[model samples]
Target: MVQAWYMDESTADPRKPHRAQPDRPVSLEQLRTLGVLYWKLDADKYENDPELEKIRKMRNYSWMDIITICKDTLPNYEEKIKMFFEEHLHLDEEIRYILEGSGYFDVRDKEDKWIRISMEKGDMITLPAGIYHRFTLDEKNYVKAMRLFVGEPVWTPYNRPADHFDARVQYMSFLEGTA
Candidate 1:
């Protein structure tokens, strides 16, 4: 199962685990309250999995690509990792299905506190558009992830302080239960 918790405010390397001192864990239901979605699948059978096909059809995930992020595989690994770790919001939803290795996804809580979500092989997660978030490989520094898109993929990331964007405004309203 996927695990999440408040991050300890530390200046350590981004790839290191940053669990809070007291281990304030957040349940899947709590994550849903923040508009996050999660699922688990058999990594070895993902390519032929009926459940995956059903999800893609239901969510209109018509486009997808597999990416391997590691010092040895990803070009410009240094720069790309830096960019990925920058707090930002996307105009479109972000969906990632992990096939191998592990990583951490941090998103802001209602009060803006960071929640570190641990993701490993077979873990799938979806972040709503306009939600401030960031990603980083764990200390292992490797991850094979399948990125899915609803239609054509939108790769643009609007950095933090983008509160004026329409997507951001709408997302805020959604959290307020007024969208």
Candidate 2:
């Protein structure tokens, strides 16, 4: 299950803290409204991932990779996580499905307030192009996920608030109306 919540940015110094409120799983409709595509796979048997099947046909994702990044692999893991912890956007949508472990995708809503979404086993999420967001592993510092791409895979992340990028500007318009 995906738990989406708003953080209380009033305290916690440099870091943001969770508010004292109920946890709400973001529905696909809500995610669409916020510029993210969220879905859960349903397969009677493990023949194939139903969500992947649907997404591939819908988006034409031609490349796929399974990634496992954890504390064991990094002498620079701490610094790396900190770098990714800051908000960023990309030219292409970031797609992922957690095969195991967990992580967090912190993104800005239409209002630019923070909405923290938790990713877990069997959860698939797509961060739309030019959406300002950041990523971090859960307390375990472990995640094995599948990354999907439409064409040549490129992981170039444009850091910080992308006020100048045209895609970012277009995305804002896309989020607000006529989208």
Candidate 3:
């Protein structure tokens, strides 16, 4: 079964970052300040480093296949036309594929339900935006994935006024302090 891992409230505090904590050895965090998400993978999964090979072979993989793998691997997966976008809001949806190692995903729903999902080699996850999510690599950084965005090009507006009241951010801040 797919596991839901980390969900940080970006709307709450821009400084309050969210990260993916793996069940195994490696730990990954999403620095809210960076606006970029990443993961590491193991080297034995495919021939000659699958992550790099895949990128080189991106042309060989159909977009439809990418979408299919993502949806088939996760629950509540939805297909969209325009790339999901967010202004003052959250990420519309993000598709991540673990190319090598293992990792965890933390997802939050509208009802405030937080789900922590784990992904190993060949695992793909589709995370809808505004659902609140984060990712982390395994203890040994043995995980890597290709990220797919399904919405219009939207930039993350940091330190906005609305972020003041976001609960996710509040929780993240608390965690950062404790860590």
RMSD of each: 1.5, 3.2, 14.5
CA lDDT, every model vs. true structure: 0.91, 0.76, 0.42
**Rank order by lDDT, top first?**
1, 2, 3
After superposition, candidate 3 runs with Cα above 4 Å error:
4-89, 151-179
Backbone collision tally, model 2:
0
Q: Model 1 off-target regions past 4 Å?
A: none
lDDT tens digits, residue span 1-179, model 2: 56777766454432333643554444556777877888776423213766568777898878888877687865677787777777899988899878888888888877788787888877888998889999888777788788989898989888975678887888887987723
List, residue by residue over 26-91, the lDDT tens digit for candidate 1. 888888878999989998887788988888898899999999999987999999999999999998
For model 1, give the 10-residue run with minimal summed lDDT.
170-179
Question: What are the per-model numbers of colliding residue pairs?
Answer: 0, 0, 40
| TM-score list, all predictions | 0.97, 0.84, 0.39
Q: Tens digit of lDDT per residue, candidate 3, span 51-91?
A: 74464355233232122223245445343211221222343
Model 3 poorest ten-residue lDDT run: 79-88
